[PDB]
Amino acid sequence: QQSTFLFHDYETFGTHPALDRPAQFAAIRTDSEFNVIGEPEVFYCKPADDYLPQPGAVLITGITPQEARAKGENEAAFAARIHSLFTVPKTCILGYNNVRFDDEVTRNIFYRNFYDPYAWSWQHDNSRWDLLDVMRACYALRPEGINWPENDDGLPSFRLEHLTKANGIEHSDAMADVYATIAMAKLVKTRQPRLFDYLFTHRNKHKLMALIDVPQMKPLVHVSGMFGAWRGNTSWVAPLAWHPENRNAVIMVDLAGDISPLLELDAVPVKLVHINKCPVLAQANTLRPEDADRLGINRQHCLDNLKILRENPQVREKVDNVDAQLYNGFFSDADRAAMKIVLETEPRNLPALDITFVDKRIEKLLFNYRARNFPGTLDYAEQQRWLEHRRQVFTPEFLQGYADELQMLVQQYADDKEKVALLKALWQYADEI
Ligand SMILES: Cc1cn([C@H]2C[C@H](O)[C@@H](COP(=O)(O)O)O2)c(=O)[nH]c1=O
Ligand SMILES: [Mg+2]
Ligand SMILES: [Mg+2]
Ligand code: NA
């Protein structure tokens, strides 16, 4: 009814958004002015017994598999709680690195648990945003008034913890990262008000499409992590064409690159810009001469490449584990309707549910869903199928490797008492599972 922001963040058991499992979700809702209006939403996800967490992830988060299992609900119920927060009308769902990471975790949790992986983002006036590329855009285009820390390599850092410390934001508990993300939003809104407004409005794919002039190859500023911190994640780009299959993807040339292989053949300075993924795009003059110089971006090289590309328009023409299979395709309307019945049927009425799916992923999705979330509902043949599944995960190579990694880390981090205790926990859990 009113426009709100839902700030959120996952802690996970590893960095693969499909093949690792979530540990904890944290979120809070604000009004359109970033005033907190909701209660903190913090909860855990019970990991199924076909999985061991990445030791490195647990050393970072401090959340053991024992803790998520004892404090969590099954992933079906975890997914339900997240889906009910995300689908409140007129919600902008945002975080810090959510476009690349947390949103991929969400898509995969929804996929595995019979929710639509995509609808949450856009239905009922919803949107997404991400403060990471907002911070990157400020550094590159409007750095005044913010402290920009360097990492140990002498490159600008966009780690949330570095930006908060550098700008006097308290950081810190479970909610610390979510509150830090709200503080970043307020920082940019205060210190770069017009840029903040511009970036917020341009989260919308139609505002982004208005910038794109393919016939003219109209140059734009693009701020992207792919460009690299050494050039402030920034270049001038030109649109060449739209993707043959992906409706949301435009094919850009990086004008700072070497266009020789693109001109001559039948590094390639070509990238996809996904207009549904909050890319930072603006008119060319948004990168001011002083900032182009600061970032080492060569205007004349970019313009020379642009001139060549415009004179050569032939360039436009030139350019298994079911858990890993989200992007194998969109489901049919019938299959989506069938999966909605799975979702909305009681888990006790699921064994008796006779329903047809055509997409070949759904049989395996359904078996995993029932065995992971509702193991008490499995019959004997299903129990034996699950035992085989666990065996095929816990291969001789995998189990040896896991033990080896723990034994290496406990020696490596011998003097870190908190890490030693976490490694003990990881061994204990692996021994059980
Ligand atoms: C920063 C970092 C995160 N992670 C995992 C655990 C975190 O819950 C998850 C998200 O962390 P982040 O949002 O700080 O990037 O990624 C690692 O496995 N290794 C790492 O070095
Ligand atoms: Mg995070
Ligand atoms: Mg954290
Ligand atoms: Na956290």
Side-chain angles (χ1 to χ4, degrees):
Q1 176 209 25
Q2 295 295 293
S3 298
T4 63
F5 292 90
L6 186 73
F7 289 83
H8 74 107
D9 189 53
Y10 294 92
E11 299 295 347
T12 67
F13 286 125
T15 56
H16 200 300
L19 294 172
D20 289 304
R21 302 294 160 83
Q24 190 202 67
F25 174 91
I28 208 164
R29 195 175 295 275
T30 79
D31 70 11
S32 62
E33 289 301 308
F34 305 128
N35 305 126
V36 173
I37 65 170
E39 292 306 306
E41 300 280 355
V42 176
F43 46 87
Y44 296 85
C45 192
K46 198 174 308 283
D49 73 352
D50 66 342
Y51 176 77
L52 291 175
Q54 300 193 317
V58 172
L59 297 183
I60 282 144
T61 65
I63 306 162
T64 62
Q66 294 93 331
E67 188 182 29
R69 185 174 62 177
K71 299 187 179 176
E73 301 168 311
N74 66 18
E75 201 179 70
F78 189 70
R81 293 186 180 264
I82 297 164
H83 186 265
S84 66
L85 293 170
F86 281 17
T87 59
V88 170
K90 303 189 81 62
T91 302
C92 177
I93 300 94
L94 77 179
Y96 196 88
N97 197 219
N98 55 295
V99 165
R100 290 170 159 167
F101 185 70
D102 307 73
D103 291 350
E104 288 299 313
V105 175
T106 298
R107 285 176 184 185
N108 278 288
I109 292 165
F110 286 179
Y111 169 69
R112 291 195 291 271
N113 297 283
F114 288 80
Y115 292 90
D116 192 304
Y118 303 104
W120 60 274
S121 191
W122 63 267
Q123 288 190 343
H124 320 110
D125 285 73
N126 284 11
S127 65
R128 69 154 67 139
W129 204 22
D130 185 341
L131 270 302
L132 168 64
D133 283 348
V134 175
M135 295 322 290
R136 288 178 168 148
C138 287
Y139 174 83
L141 308 173
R142 300 292 184 273
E144 179 190 344
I146 296 176
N147 300 138
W148 301 107
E150 282 179 9
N151 64 30
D152 287 348
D153 295 339
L155 297 160
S157 181
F158 300 92
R159 287 289 316 165
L160 185 62
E161 63 273 17
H162 294 163
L163 289 170
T164 56
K165 184 68 187 152
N167 289 282
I169 289 146
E170 188 69 72
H171 192 200
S172 47
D173 65 294
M175 287 299 294
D177 298 321
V178 168
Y179 288 132
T181 309
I182 300 168
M184 292 289 98
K186 294 177 184 178
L187 177 78
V188 183
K189 184 166 189 212
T190 303
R191 300 198 198 173
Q192 288 295 343
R194 301 266 195 86
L195 184 65
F196 194 80
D197 288 342
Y198 173 88
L199 293 170
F200 178 65
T201 305
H202 286 76
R203 83 196 182 286
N204 178 279
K205 68 181 179 179
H206 306 305
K207 292 292 291 186
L208 295 165
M209 269 183 273
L211 300 173
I212 299 159
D213 194 332
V214 173
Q216 295 308 314
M217 300 184 182
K218 185 160 192 165
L220 297 172
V221 307
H222 180 42
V223 182
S224 174
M226 273 160 81
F227 287 150
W230 62 271
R231 53 169 160 170
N233 301 117
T234 296
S235 205
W236 279 302
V237 300
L240 292 174
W242 285 85
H243 199 282
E245 285 302 308
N246 191 338
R247 211 183 181 182
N248 290 311
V250 67
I251 306 155
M252 296 289 196
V253 56
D254 178 6
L255 295 172
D258 175 18
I259 67 164
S260 295
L262 202 61
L263 304 168
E264 291 165 22
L265 306 174
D266 59 326
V268 197
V270 159
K271 90 176 286 275
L272 302 180
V273 171
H274 296 266
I275 64 168
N276 67 320
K277 293 276 175 99
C278 308
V280 174
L281 288 172
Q283 58 176 310
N285 74 357
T286 307
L287 178 64
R288 291 168 173 154
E290 53 271 37
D291 293 304
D293 293 351
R294 182 175 50 96
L295 301 180
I297 301 164
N298 189 329
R299 180 189 299 276
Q300 197 48 46
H301 179 77
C302 291
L303 290 175
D304 291 345
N305 277 166
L306 182 62
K307 286 188 188 199
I308 298 162
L309 290 153
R310 287 171 169 167
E311 282 158 12
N312 299 95
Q314 66 268 23
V315 171
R316 311 182 188 279
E317 284 59 54
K318 290 194 189 186
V319 263
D320 201 43
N321 193 347
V322 74
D323 282 354
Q325 289 177 4
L326 170 63
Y327 298 119
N328 281 34
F330 306 100
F331 297 98
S332 75
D333 281 10
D335 280 352
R336 271 142 65 192
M339 286 190 291
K340 180 180 167 166
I341 293 158
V342 171
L343 175 64
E344 297 183 344
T345 301
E346 304 215 78
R348 58 146 187 153
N349 291 161
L350 267 180
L353 187 72
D354 285 325
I355 191 137
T356 306
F357 314 106
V358 291
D359 191 287
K360 298 288 174 280
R361 296 170 286 174
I362 311 165
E363 195 290 325
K364 293 178 262 77
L365 284 171
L366 180 59
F367 174 71
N368 285 351
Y369 176 74
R370 293 191 50 229
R372 289 177 175 153
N373 293 115
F374 313 115
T377 72
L378 302 184
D379 72 11
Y380 177 80
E382 285 165 339
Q383 290 176 331
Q384 296 306 115
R385 187 180 168 179
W386 189 245
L387 200 287
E388 183 54 18
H389 168 87
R390 295 178 82 246
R391 212 202 108 250
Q392 292 196 256
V393 176
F394 301 135
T395 64
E397 200 74 39
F398 177 77
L399 293 173
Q400 193 54 61
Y402 202 88
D404 289 354
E405 187 179 351
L406 295 180
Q407 288 173 259
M408 180 206 64
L409 288 168
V410 83
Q411 292 182 43
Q412 184 179 1
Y413 295 113
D415 297 323
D416 187 321
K417 293 134 159 217
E418 283 88 6
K419 283 178 180 52
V420 172
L422 293 165
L423 291 158
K424 186 189 166 177
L426 290 157
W427 190 280
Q428 197 281 335
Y429 189 73
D431 273 23
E432 188 200 319
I433 300 300

mmCIF file with all atom_site columns, all heavy atoms in Angstrom, residues 9-10 96 102, ligand 2:
data_model
loop_
_atom_site.group_PDB
_atom_site.id
_atom_site.type_symbol
_atom_site.label_atom_id
_atom_site.label_alt_id
_atom_site.label_comp_id
_atom_site.label_asym_id
_atom_site.label_entity_id
_atom_site.label_seq_id
_atom_site.pdbx_PDB_ins_code
_atom_site.Cartn_x
_atom_site.Cartn_y
_atom_site.Cartn_z
_atom_site.occupancy
_atom_site.B_iso_or_equiv
_atom_site.pdbx_formal_charge
_atom_site.auth_seq_id
_atom_site.auth_comp_id
_atom_site.auth_asym_id
_atom_site.auth_atom_id
_atom_site.pdbx_PDB_model_num
ATOM   1  N  N   . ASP A 1 9   ? 19.767 -9.877  4.005  1.00 0.00 ? 9   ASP A N   1
ATOM   2  C  CA  . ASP A 1 9   ? 21.072 -10.494 3.840  1.00 0.00 ? 9   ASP A CA  1
ATOM   3  C  C   . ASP A 1 9   ? 21.033 -11.936 4.295  1.00 0.00 ? 9   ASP A C   1
ATOM   4  O  O   . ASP A 1 9   ? 20.422 -12.245 5.334  1.00 0.00 ? 9   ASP A O   1
ATOM   5  C  CB  . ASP A 1 9   ? 22.086 -9.730  4.691  1.00 0.00 ? 9   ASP A CB  1
ATOM   6  C  CG  . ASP A 1 9   ? 23.509 -10.139 4.439  1.00 0.00 ? 9   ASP A CG  1
ATOM   7  O  OD1 . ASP A 1 9   ? 23.957 -10.137 3.270  1.00 0.00 ? 9   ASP A OD1 1
ATOM   8  O  OD2 . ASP A 1 9   ? 24.198 -10.462 5.430  1.00 0.00 ? 9   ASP A OD2 1
ATOM   9  N  N   . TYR A 1 10  ? 21.683 -12.802 3.512  1.00 0.00 ? 10  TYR A N   1
ATOM   10 C  CA  . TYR A 1 10  ? 21.920 -14.202 3.930  1.00 0.00 ? 10  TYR A CA  1
ATOM   11 C  C   . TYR A 1 10  ? 23.304 -14.442 4.486  1.00 0.00 ? 10  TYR A C   1
ATOM   12 O  O   . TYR A 1 10  ? 24.282 -13.836 4.015  1.00 0.00 ? 10  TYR A O   1
ATOM   13 C  CB  . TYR A 1 10  ? 21.792 -15.156 2.775  1.00 0.00 ? 10  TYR A CB  1
ATOM   14 C  CG  . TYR A 1 10  ? 20.448 -15.324 2.157  1.00 0.00 ? 10  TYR A CG  1
ATOM   15 C  CD1 . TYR A 1 10  ? 20.081 -14.522 1.059  1.00 0.00 ? 10  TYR A CD1 1
ATOM   16 C  CD2 . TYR A 1 10  ? 19.531 -16.282 2.633  1.00 0.00 ? 10  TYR A CD2 1
ATOM   17 C  CE1 . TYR A 1 10  ? 18.815 -14.669 0.435  1.00 0.00 ? 10  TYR A CE1 1
ATOM   18 C  CE2 . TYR A 1 10  ? 18.258 -16.444 2.021  1.00 0.00 ? 10  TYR A CE2 1
ATOM   19 C  CZ  . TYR A 1 10  ? 17.910 -15.626 0.920  1.00 0.00 ? 10  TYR A CZ  1
ATOM   20 O  OH  . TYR A 1 10  ? 16.676 -15.788 0.326  1.00 0.00 ? 10  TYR A OH  1
ATOM   21 N  N   . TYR A 1 96  ? 23.219 -5.766  -0.102 1.00 0.00 ? 96  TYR A N   1
ATOM   22 C  CA  . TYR A 1 96  ? 24.564 -5.333  -0.430 1.00 0.00 ? 96  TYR A CA  1
ATOM   23 C  C   . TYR A 1 96  ? 25.244 -6.503  -1.080 1.00 0.00 ? 96  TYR A C   1
ATOM   24 O  O   . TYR A 1 96  ? 25.644 -7.454  -0.408 1.00 0.00 ? 96  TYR A O   1
ATOM   25 C  CB  . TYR A 1 96  ? 25.321 -4.850  0.852  1.00 0.00 ? 96  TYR A CB  1
ATOM   26 C  CG  . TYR A 1 96  ? 26.521 -4.054  0.440  1.00 0.00 ? 96  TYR A CG  1
ATOM   27 C  CD1 . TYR A 1 96  ? 26.405 -2.667  0.208  1.00 0.00 ? 96  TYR A CD1 1
ATOM   28 C  CD2 . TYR A 1 96  ? 27.783 -4.678  0.263  1.00 0.00 ? 96  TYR A CD2 1
ATOM   29 C  CE1 . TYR A 1 96  ? 27.524 -1.917  -0.195 1.00 0.00 ? 96  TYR A CE1 1
ATOM   30 C  CE2 . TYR A 1 96  ? 28.885 -3.935  -0.138 1.00 0.00 ? 96  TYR A CE2 1
ATOM   31 C  CZ  . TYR A 1 96  ? 28.761 -2.554  -0.365 1.00 0.00 ? 96  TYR A CZ  1
ATOM   32 O  OH  . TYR A 1 96  ? 29.829 -1.776  -0.765 1.00 0.00 ? 96  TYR A OH  1
ATOM   33 N  N   . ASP A 1 102 ? 22.868 -12.726 -3.069 1.00 0.00 ? 102 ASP A N   1
ATOM   34 C  CA  . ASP A 1 102 ? 21.660 -13.083 -2.294 1.00 0.00 ? 102 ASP A CA  1
ATOM   35 C  C   . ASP A 1 102 ? 20.464 -13.379 -3.170 1.00 0.00 ? 102 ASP A C   1
ATOM   36 O  O   . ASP A 1 102 ? 19.727 -14.300 -2.875 1.00 0.00 ? 102 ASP A O   1
ATOM   37 C  CB  . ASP A 1 102 ? 21.331 -11.998 -1.261 1.00 0.00 ? 102 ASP A CB  1
ATOM   38 C  CG  . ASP A 1 102 ? 22.512 -11.686 -0.381 1.00 0.00 ? 102 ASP A CG  1
ATOM   39 O  OD1 . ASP A 1 102 ? 23.446 -11.035 -0.917 1.00 0.00 ? 102 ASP A OD1 1
ATOM   40 O  OD2 . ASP A 1 102 ? 22.496 -12.091 0.805  1.00 0.00 ? 102 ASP A OD2 1
HETATM 41 MG MG  . MG  B 2 .   ? 25.834 -10.600 2.470  1.00 0.00 ? 2   MG  B MG  1
#
